[PDB]
Amino acid sequence: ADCGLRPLFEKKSLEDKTERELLESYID
Amino acid sequence: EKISMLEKIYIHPRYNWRENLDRDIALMKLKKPVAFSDYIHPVCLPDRETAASLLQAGYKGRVTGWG
């Protein structure tokens, strides 16, 4: 239920250096 | 980090280690439930909607390891 959220990123409203690459590639 | 001991091992009944690694999956029920921290935290398994929508050509996945 708190699966996939990441204390040092998604919880600190934060982002990693190549995660924008995953997101740009999709279409939902 | 954290070292853990295993209590059980479960292997897909139909693994094909023999023909072509079909259903290459095993579950390791830990011995002692670990404690989440800022470096320990589960991951999500998808539902029919996240798979249908995500599982797609040109759609990027991220891979990690020590190989």
Binding site: G4 | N20, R23, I25, Y59, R62, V63, T64
Partner: protein
């Protein structure tokens, strides 16, 4: 290696998968990597096996384990994709024993 390593890659299409190997591709697996034209490089190797395949959802912002690094034919080879256990597909199973 020396530090945990990360590499992002494109789920590749069925036909292009089947074509890259002699071996029988099933419903439970998927290839991912850059085609030899796509420019970009990278892949999985040995002791990488079992490693996760994850995707970050736009819907919520939680990651999902998309597959399991299942097999190959070398590493970084032009023309070959990496085979992945199709998690979504063995989930009923995964259910069964966890809940069991």
């Amino acid at each position: 290696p020396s530090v945990l390593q990360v590499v992002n890659l494109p789920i590749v299409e069925r036909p292009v998968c089947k074509d890259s190997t002699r071996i029988r591709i099933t419903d439970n697996m998927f290839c991912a990597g850059y085609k030899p034209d796509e420019g970009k490089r990278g892949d999985a190797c040995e002791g990488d096996s079992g490693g996760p395949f994850v995707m970050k959802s736009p819907f919520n912002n939680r990651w999902y384990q998309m597959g399991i690094v299942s097999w190959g034919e070398g590493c970084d080879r032009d023309g070959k994709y990496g085979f992945y256990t199709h998690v979504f597909r063995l989930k009923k199973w995964i259910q069964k024993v966890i809940d069991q």
